[PDB]
mmCIF file of C-alpha atoms in Angstrom:
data_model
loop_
_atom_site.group_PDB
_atom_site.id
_atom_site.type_symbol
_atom_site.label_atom_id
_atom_site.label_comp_id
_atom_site.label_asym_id
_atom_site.label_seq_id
_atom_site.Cartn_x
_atom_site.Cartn_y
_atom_site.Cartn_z
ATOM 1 C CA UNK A 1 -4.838 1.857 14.480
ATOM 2 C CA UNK A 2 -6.414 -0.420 16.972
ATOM 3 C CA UNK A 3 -5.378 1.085 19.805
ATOM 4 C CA UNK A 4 -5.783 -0.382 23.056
ATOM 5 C CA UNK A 5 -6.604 -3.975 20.714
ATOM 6 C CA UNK A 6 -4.322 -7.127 21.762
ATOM 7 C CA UNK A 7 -2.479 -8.544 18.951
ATOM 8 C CA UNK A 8 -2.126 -12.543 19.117
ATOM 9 C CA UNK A 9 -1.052 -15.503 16.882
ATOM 10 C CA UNK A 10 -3.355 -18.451 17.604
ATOM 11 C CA UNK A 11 -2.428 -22.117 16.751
ATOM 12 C CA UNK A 12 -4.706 -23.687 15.450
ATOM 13 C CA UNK A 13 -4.996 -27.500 14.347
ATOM 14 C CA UNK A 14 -3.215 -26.941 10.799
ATOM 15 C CA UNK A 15 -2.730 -22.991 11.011
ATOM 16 C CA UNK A 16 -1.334 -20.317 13.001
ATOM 17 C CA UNK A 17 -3.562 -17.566 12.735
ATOM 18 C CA UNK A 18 -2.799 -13.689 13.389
ATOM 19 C CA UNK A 19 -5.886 -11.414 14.987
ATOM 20 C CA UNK A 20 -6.404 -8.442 16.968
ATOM 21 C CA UNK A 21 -9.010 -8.311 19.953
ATOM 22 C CA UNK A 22 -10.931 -6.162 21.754
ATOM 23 C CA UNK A 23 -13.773 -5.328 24.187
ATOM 24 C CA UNK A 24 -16.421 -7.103 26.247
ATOM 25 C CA UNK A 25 -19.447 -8.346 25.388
ATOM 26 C CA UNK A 26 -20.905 -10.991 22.963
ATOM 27 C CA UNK A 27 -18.061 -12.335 20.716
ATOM 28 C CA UNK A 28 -18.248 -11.266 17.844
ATOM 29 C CA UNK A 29 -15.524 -12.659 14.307
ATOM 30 C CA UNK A 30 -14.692 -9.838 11.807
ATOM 31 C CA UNK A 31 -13.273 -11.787 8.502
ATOM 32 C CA UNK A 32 -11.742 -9.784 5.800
ATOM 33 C CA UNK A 33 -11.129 -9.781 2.044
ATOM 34 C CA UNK A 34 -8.845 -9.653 -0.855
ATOM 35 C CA UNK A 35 -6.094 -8.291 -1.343
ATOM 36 C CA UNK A 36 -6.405 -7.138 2.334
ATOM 37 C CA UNK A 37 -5.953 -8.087 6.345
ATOM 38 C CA UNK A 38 -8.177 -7.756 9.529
ATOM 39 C CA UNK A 39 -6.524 -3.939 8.903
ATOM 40 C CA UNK A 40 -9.675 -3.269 7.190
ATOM 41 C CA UNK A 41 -11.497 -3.471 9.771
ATOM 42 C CA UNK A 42 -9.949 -0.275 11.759
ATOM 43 C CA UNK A 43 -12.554 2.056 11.372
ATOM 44 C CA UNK A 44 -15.149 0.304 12.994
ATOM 45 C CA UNK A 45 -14.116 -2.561 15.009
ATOM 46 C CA UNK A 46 -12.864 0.063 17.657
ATOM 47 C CA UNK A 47 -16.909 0.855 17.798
ATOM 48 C CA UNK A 48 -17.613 -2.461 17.605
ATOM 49 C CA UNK A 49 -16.034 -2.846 20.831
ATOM 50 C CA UNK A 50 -17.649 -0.538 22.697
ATOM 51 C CA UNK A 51 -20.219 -3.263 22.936
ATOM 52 C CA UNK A 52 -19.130 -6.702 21.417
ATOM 53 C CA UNK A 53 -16.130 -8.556 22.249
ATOM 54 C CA UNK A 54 -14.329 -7.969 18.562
ATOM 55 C CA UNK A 55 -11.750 -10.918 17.146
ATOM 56 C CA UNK A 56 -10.526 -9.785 13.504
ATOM 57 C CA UNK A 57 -8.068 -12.541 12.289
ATOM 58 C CA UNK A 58 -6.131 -12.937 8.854
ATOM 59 C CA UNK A 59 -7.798 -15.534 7.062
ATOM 60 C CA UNK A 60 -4.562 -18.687 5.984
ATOM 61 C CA UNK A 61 -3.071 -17.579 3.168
ATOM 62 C CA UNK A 62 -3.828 -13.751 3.825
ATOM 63 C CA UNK A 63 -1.805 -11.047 6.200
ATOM 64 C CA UNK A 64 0.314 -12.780 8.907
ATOM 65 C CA UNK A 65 -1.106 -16.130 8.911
ATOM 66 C CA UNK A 66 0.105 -19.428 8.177
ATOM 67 C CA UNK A 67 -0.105 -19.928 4.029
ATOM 68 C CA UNK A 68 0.679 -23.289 3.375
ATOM 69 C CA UNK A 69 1.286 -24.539 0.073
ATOM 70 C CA UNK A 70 -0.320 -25.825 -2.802
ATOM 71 C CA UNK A 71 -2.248 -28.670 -2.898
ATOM 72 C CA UNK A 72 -4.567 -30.856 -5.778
ATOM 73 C CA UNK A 73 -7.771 -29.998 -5.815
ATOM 74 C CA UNK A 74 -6.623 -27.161 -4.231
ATOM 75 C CA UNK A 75 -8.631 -28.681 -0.741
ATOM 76 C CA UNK A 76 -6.427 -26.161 1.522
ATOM 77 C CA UNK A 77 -7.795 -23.037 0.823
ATOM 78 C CA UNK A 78 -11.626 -24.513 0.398
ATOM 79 C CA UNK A 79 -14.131 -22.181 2.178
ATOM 80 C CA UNK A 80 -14.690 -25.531 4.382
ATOM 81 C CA UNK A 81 -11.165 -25.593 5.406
ATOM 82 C CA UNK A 82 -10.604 -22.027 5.973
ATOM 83 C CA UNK A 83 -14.172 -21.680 7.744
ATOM 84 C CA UNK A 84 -12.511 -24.288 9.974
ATOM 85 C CA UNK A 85 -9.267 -22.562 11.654
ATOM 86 C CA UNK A 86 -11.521 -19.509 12.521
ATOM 87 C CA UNK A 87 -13.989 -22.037 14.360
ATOM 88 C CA UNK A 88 -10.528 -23.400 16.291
ATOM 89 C CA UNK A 89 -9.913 -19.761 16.872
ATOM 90 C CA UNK A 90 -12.998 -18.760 18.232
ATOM 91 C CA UNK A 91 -12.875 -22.098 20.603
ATOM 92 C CA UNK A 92 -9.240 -21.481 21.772
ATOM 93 C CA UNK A 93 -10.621 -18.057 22.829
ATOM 94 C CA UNK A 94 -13.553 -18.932 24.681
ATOM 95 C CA UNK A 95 -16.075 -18.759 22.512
ATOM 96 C CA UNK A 96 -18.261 -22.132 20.893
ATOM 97 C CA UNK A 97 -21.040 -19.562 19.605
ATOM 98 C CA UNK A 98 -20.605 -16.096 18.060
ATOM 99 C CA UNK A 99 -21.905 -13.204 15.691
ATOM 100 C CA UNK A 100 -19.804 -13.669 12.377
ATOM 101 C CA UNK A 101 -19.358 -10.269 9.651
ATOM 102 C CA UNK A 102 -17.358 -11.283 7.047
ATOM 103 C CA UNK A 103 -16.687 -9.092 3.751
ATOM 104 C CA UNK A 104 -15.453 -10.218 0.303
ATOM 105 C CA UNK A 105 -13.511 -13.646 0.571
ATOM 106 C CA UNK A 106 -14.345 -13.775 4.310
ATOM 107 C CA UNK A 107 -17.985 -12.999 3.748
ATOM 108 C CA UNK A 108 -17.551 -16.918 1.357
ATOM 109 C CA UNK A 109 -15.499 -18.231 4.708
ATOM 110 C CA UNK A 110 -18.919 -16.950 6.833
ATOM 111 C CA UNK A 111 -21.104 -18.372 3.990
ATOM 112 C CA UNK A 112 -19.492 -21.900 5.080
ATOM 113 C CA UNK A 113 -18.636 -21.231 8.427
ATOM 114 C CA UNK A 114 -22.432 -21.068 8.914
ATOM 115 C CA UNK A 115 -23.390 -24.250 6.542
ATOM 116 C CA UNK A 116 -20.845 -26.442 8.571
ATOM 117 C CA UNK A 117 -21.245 -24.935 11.755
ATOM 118 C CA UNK A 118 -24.712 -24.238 12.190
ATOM 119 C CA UNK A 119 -24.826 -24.435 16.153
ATOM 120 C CA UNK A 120 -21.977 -21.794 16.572
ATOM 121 C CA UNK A 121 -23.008 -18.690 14.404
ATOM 122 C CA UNK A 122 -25.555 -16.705 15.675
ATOM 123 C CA UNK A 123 -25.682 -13.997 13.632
ATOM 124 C CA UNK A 124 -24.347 -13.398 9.823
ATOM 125 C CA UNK A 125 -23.392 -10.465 8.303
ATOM 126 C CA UNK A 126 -22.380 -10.569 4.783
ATOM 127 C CA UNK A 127 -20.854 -7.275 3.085
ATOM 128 C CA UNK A 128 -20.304 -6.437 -0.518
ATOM 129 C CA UNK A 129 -21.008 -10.323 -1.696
ATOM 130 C CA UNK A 130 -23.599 -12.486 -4.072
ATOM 131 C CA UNK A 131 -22.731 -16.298 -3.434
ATOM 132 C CA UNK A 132 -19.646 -17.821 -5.246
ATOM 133 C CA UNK A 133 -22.089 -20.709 -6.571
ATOM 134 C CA UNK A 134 -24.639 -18.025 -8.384
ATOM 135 C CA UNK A 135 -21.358 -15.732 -9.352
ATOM 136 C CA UNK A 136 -19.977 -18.654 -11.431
ATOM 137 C CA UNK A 137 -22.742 -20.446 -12.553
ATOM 138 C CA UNK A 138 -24.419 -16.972 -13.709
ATOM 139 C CA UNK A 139 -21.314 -15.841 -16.022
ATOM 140 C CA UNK A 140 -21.555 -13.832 -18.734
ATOM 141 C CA UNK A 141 -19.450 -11.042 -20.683
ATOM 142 C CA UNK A 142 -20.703 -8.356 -18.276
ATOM 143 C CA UNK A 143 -19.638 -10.094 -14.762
ATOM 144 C CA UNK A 144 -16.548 -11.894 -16.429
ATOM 145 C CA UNK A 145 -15.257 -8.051 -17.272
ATOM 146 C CA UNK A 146 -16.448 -6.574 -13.986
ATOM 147 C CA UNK A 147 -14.527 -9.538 -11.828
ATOM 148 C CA UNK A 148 -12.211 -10.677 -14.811
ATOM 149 C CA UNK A 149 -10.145 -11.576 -11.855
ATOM 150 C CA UNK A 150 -12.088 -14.470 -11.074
ATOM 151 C CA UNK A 151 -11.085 -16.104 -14.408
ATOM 152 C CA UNK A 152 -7.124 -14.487 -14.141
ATOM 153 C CA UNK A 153 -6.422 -15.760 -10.560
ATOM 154 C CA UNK A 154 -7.213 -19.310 -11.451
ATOM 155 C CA UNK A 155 -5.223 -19.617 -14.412
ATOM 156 C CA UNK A 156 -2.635 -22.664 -14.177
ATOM 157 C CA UNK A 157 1.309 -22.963 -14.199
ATOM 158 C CA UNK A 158 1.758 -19.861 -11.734
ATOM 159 C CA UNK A 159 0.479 -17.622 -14.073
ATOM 160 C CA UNK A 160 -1.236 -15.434 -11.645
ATOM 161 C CA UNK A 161 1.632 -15.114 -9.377
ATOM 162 C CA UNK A 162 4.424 -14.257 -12.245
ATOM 163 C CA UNK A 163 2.293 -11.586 -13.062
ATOM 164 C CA UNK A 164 1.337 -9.990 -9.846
ATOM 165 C CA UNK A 165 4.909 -11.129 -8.594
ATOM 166 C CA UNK A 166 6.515 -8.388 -10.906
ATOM 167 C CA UNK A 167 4.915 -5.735 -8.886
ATOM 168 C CA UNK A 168 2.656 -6.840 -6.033
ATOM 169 C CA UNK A 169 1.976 -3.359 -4.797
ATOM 170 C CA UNK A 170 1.212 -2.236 -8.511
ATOM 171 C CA UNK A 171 -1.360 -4.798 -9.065
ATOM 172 C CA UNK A 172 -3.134 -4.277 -5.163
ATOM 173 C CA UNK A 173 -3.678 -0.569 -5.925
ATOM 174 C CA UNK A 174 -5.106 -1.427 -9.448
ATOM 175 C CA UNK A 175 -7.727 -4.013 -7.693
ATOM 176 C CA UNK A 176 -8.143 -1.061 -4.838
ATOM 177 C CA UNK A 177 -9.456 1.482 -7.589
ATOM 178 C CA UNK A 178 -11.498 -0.763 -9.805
ATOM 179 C CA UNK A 179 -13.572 -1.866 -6.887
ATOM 180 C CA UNK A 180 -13.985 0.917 -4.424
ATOM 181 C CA UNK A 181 -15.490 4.080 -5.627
ATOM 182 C CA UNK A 182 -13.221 6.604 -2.614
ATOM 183 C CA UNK A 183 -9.505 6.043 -2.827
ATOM 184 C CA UNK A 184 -9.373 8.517 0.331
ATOM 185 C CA UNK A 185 -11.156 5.952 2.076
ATOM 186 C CA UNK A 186 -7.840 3.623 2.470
ATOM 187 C CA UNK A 187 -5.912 5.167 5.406
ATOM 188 C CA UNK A 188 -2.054 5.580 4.275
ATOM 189 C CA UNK A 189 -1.156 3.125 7.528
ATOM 190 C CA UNK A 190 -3.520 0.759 6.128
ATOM 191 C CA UNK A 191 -2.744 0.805 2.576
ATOM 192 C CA UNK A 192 1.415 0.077 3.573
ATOM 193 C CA UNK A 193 0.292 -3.183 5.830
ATOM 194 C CA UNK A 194 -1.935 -4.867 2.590
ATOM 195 C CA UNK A 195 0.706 -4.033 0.548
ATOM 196 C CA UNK A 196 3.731 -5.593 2.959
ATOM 197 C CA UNK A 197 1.250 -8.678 3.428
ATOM 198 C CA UNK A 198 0.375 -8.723 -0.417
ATOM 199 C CA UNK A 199 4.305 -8.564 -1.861
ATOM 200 C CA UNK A 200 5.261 -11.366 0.077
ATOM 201 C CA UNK A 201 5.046 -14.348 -3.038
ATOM 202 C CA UNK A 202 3.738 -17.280 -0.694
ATOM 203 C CA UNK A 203 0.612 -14.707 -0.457
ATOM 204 C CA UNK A 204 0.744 -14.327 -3.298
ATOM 205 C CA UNK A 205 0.102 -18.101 -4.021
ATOM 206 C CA UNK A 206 -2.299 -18.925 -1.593
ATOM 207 C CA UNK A 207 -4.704 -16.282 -2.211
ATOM 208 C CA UNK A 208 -4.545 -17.051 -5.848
ATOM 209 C CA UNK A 209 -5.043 -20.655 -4.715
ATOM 210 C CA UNK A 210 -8.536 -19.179 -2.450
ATOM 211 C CA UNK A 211 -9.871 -18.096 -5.967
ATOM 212 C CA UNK A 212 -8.465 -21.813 -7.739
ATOM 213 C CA UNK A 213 -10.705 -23.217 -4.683
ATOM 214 C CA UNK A 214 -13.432 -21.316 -5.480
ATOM 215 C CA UNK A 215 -14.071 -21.865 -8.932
ATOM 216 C CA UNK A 216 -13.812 -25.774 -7.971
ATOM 217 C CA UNK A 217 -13.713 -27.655 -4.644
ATOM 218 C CA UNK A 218 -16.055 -24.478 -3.484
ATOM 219 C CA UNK A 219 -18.287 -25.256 -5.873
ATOM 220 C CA UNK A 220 -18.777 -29.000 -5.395
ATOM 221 C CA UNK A 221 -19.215 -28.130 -1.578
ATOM 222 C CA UNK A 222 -22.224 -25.707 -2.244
ATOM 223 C CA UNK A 223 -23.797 -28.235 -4.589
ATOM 224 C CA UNK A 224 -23.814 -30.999 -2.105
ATOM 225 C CA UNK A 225 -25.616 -28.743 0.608
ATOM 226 C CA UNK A 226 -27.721 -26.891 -2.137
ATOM 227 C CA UNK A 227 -30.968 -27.583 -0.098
ATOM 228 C CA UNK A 228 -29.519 -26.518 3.250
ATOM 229 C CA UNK A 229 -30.252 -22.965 4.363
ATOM 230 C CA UNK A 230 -28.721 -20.615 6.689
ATOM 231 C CA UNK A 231 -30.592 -21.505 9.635
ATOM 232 C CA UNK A 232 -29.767 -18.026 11.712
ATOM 233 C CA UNK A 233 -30.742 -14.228 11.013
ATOM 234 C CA UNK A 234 -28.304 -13.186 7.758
ATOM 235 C CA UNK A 235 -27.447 -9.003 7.154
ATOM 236 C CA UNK A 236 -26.435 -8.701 3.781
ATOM 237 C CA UNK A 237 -25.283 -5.150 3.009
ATOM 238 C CA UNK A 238 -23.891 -4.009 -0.572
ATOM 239 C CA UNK A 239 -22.252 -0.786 -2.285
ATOM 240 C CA UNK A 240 -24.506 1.293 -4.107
ATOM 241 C CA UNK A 241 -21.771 2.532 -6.393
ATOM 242 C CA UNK A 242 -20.715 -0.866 -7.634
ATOM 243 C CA UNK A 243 -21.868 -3.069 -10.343
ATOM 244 C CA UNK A 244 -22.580 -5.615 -7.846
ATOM 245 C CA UNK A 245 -26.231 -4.280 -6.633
ATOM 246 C CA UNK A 246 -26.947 -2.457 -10.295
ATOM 247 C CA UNK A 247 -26.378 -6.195 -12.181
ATOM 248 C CA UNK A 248 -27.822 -8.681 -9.176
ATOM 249 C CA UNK A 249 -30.576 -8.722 -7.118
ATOM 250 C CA UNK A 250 -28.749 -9.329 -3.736
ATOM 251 C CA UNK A 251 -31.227 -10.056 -1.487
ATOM 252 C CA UNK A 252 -33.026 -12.413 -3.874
ATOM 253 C CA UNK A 253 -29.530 -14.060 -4.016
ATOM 254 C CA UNK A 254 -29.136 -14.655 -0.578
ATOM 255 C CA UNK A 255 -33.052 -15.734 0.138
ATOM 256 C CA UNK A 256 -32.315 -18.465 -2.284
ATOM 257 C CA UNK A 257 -29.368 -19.552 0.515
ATOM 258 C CA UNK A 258 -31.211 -18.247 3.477
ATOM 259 C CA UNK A 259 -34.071 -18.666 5.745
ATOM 260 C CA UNK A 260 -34.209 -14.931 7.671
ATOM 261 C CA UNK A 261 -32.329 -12.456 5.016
ATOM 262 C CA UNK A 262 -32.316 -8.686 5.300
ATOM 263 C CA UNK A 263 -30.264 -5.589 4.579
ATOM 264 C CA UNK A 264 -29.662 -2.988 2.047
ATOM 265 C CA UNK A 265 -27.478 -1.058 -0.205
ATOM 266 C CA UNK A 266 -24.746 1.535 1.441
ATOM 267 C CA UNK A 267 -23.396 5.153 -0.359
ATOM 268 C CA UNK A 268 -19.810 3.540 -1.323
ATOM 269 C CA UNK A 269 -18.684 1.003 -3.781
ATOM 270 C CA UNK A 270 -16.852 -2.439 -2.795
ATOM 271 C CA UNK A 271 -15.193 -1.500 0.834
ATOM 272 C CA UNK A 272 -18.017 -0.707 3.193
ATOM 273 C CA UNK A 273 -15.781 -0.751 6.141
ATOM 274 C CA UNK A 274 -13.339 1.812 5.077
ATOM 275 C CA UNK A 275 -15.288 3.582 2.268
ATOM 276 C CA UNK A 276 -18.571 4.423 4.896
ATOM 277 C CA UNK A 277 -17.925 2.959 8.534
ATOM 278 C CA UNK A 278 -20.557 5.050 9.736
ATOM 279 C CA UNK A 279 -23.412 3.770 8.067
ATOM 280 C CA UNK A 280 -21.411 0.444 8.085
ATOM 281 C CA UNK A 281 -21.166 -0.046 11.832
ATOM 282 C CA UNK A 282 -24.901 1.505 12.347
ATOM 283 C CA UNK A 283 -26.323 -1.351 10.196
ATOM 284 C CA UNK A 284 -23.898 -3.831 11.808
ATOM 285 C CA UNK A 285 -24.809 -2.420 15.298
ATOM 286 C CA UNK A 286 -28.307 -3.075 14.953
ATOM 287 C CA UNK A 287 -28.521 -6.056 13.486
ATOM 288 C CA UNK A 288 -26.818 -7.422 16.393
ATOM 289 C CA UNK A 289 -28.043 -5.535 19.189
ATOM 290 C CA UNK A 290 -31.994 -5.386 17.657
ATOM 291 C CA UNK A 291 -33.665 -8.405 16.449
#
């Protein structure tokens, strides 16, 4: 996997963050999701490549990075704070503009990164997401089953981590099959890395402490830019086989948050990237390249 890709560890202000790079070309950020690393990205940021210059990091809290630990409020892990080591990153590389494609968690870091940055991102691809704000404050039995882990992982008193701490690698595989609709999809190489990430317990914590953040500090952020749209051109592109584009409209959800919003549905459920990277990178491709 990522071969011919440099693997660095950049400092950042108050995180050291892990990434792999390749290519030449327009820079171009590739964040990644839960309970994964920039690994998921290995299908397609080799294509990428070919005409971008690709940086896929590990978000803090996530794969090699720095994970510091908890704080009140939980202000650490806010999408504000982790949007702002990947702008340090980008800047220690070169780069004070770039394209950003986030998925899952790091599609709600690109969300942010884009509110607080507005000057730097470019271009905005968003994969497999509805906004955390509209998530939340749209509840009900069916989405509260579908993503009960939105209501587990924020549970007080280390709950969370006692429970996935008993078997990490039990409880990744679990999430793995609920939301993707291909199992085949997850290369074995691929699987072993989120799983050595994952069953490390300070992980453990601070991703658990990304979902605290989320249904809170998050939350206040988003209200108190509510009016303020993404200014630049926004992909969003979704799994067809998921709940996620059969119970929201996800377009309509991201026109509500965005000035210039298009994209569609893809033949896989939750992980585009590794589930179909052909029709994943061809919609990323030209969406960059053609607009």
């Amino acid at each position: 996997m990522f071969t011919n890709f440099e693997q660095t560890i950049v400092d950042t202000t108050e995180a050291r963050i892990n990434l792999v790079k390749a290519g030449h070309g327009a820079p171009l950020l590739l964040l990644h999701g839960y309970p994964q690393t920039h690994v998921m990205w290995h299908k397609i940021a080799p294509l990428l490549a070919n005409n971008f210059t690709v940086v896929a990091t590990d978000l803090r809290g996530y794969g090699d990075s720095s994970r510091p630990a908890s704080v009140p409020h939980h202000i650490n892990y806010s999408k504000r704070v982790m949007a702002q080591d990947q702008v340090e990153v980008m800047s220690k590389l070169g780069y004070e503009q770039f394209y950003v494609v986030g998925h899952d968690r790091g599609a709600r870091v690109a969300h942010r990164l884009a509110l607080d940055h507005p000057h730097r991102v470019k271009k905005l691809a968003l994969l497999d997401i509805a906004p955390t704000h509209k998530m939340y404050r749209t509840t009900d039995q069916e989405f509260a089953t579908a993503y009960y882990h939105w209501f587990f992982l924020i549970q007080p008193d280390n709950l969370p981590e006692t429970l996935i701490g008993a078997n990490p690698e039990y409880y990744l595989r679990k999430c793995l099959e609920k939301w993707g609709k291909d199992f085949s999809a997850f290369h074995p190489q691929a699987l072993a890395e989120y799983i050595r990430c994952f069953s490390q317990p300070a992980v453990i914590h601070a991703t658990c402490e990304d979902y605290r953040a989320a249904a809170t500090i998050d939350l206040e952020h988003d209200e108190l830019d509510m009016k303020q749209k993404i200014s630049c051109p926004v992909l969003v592109l979704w799994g067809e086989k998921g709940i996620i584009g059969r119970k929201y409209d996800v377009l309509a959800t991201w026109r509500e948050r965005a000035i210039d919003v298009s994209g569609q549905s893809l033949p896989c459920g939750h992980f585009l990237p590794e589930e179909a990277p052909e029709e994943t990178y061809q919609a990323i491709y030209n969406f960059l390249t053609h607009c």
